[PDB]
């Protein structure tokens, strides 16, 4: 538990240290997207040829 620190260290001025760990961190990482081989598909349409009676 967190409370025993109060007896041992007082739990003061620590807060910023905890903040250092807890805060979100971000930086742009560029990269690749890859995976195992997968299914894919396709649809092609032709020219609609003029028909007559």
């Amino acid at each position: 538990d967190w409370n025993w620190t109060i007896q041992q260290n007082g739990l003061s001025t620590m807060q910023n240290n905890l903040a250092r760990v807890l805060r979100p961190v971000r930086a742009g990482i560029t990269g690749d997207f890859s995976a195992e081989s997968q299914f894919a598909g396709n649809i092609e349409i032709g020219a609609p040829v003029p028909l007559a009676a």
């Binding site: 040829v49 003029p50 028909l51 007559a52």
Partner: protein, 53 residues
């Protein structure tokens, strides 16, 4: 090859197959030589009331 054997050259007619890009072909009206009736199902919607259609 200048030998008495029976051999002669032969050229096969193909098992014809065709494809047609153009509009240039057509099938006429259908005729039914014979017909047997497998099944029939009948139904109706009754809508007496004015509004709900």
């Amino acid at each position: 090859d200048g030998y008495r054997c029976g051999d002669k050259t032969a050229i096969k007619v193909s098992n014809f197959a065709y494809n047609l890009d153009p509009d240039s072909f057509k099938h006429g009206d259908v005729t039914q030589s014979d017909r047997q009736l497998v099944k029939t199902v009948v139904g109706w919607a009754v809508n007496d009331s004015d509004t709900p259609q």
